[PDB]
């Protein structure tokens, strides 16, 4: 039930330009809502500002596809 | 007592090349040891890899100056 949602989250993140994998995804229910935290991989040669833009793009992409999510935080690490 | 340690932490971080402020510092005692978490500001045009190197440098600088610290995590955001 949750694994199906986790899979949809990872797939949505991986379709955003600049994502080099999902390093980490924590997702849990608060009532019927999902609260999640994730770390994406990015090109180490991207700027801090570009990494920020990719994170934002993932947040928007994931939240737009998975409507039960009411909190999502995305950070980036080199990969 | 803790504020004096927090001040030493911020000052140690600010002396590392590439640090553009301390955005966030949480520090608490676990017994006599300090466990801390901090966010530094960095140039948005630095690479992800450079930001990583600055974080490492801050970790080493802070831990070397403040000997009671037994856990320190450092991350970076644009500023």
Residue numbers in the entry:
A (entry chain A), B (entry chain A): 213 to 291
Sentences from the paper on this structure:
Each MamM monomer (residues 215–293) adopts the metallochaperone-like typical fold of CDF CTDs whilst the C-terminal tail (residues 294–318) is disordered and could not be traced in the electron density map. To validate that the disordered C-terminal tail have no effect on the domain fold, we determined the structures of a C-terminal truncation MamM-CTD mutant (residues 215–293) that adopted a similar CTD fold. As observed previously, the decreased number of particles per cell was at least partially a consequence of a substantial number of cells within the population that remained non-magnetic (10–20%). These previous studies also revealed that transcomplementation of a truncated C-terminal tail MamM mutant also allows the formation of wild-type-like particle. ITC measurements of the CTD single point mutants and the C-terminal truncation mutant revealed that the binding affinities remained in the same order of magnitude as the wild-type, with some alternation in the number of binding sites.
